[PDB]
Amino acid sequence: EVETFAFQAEIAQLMSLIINTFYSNKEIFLRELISNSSDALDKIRYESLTDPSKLDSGKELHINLIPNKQDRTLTIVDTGIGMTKADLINNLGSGTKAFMEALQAGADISMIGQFGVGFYSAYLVAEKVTVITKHNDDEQYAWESSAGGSFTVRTDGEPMGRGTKVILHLKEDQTEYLEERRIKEIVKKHSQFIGYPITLFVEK
Ligand X SMILES: CN(C)c1ncnc2nc[nH]c12
Q: Which of 116, 115, 118, 120 is nearest to 101 (CA)?
A: 115
Residue 41 has what DSSP assignment?
A: H
Q: Which does 52 bind (CB under 5 to 8 A by kind): its own copies, ligand X, none?
A: none
Q: Which does 166 bind (CB under 5 to 8 A by kind): ligand X, its own copies, none?
A: ligand X
* CB 27, min distance to its own copies, A: 19
Spatial contact of 122 and 112, defined as CB atoms under 8 Å apart: no
Q: Interaction with its own copies in 125-164: which residues (CB under 8 A)?
A: none
By beta-carbon proximity to ligand X, the closer residue of 61 and 81 is 81
Rounded CA gap, 100 and 123, in Å?
17
Per CB under 6 A, the segment of 7-15, 33-41, 45-53, 137-145 that binds ligand X is 33-41
Among 73, 96, 130, 164, binds ligand X (CB under 6 A): 164
- In the chain, what is the greatest distance between 2 CA atoms, to the nearest angstrom? 47
Rounded CA gap, 81 and 196, in Å?
14
For ligand X, the binding residues (CB under 6 A) are 36-37, 40, 78, 80-81, 83, 91, 119, 164, 166
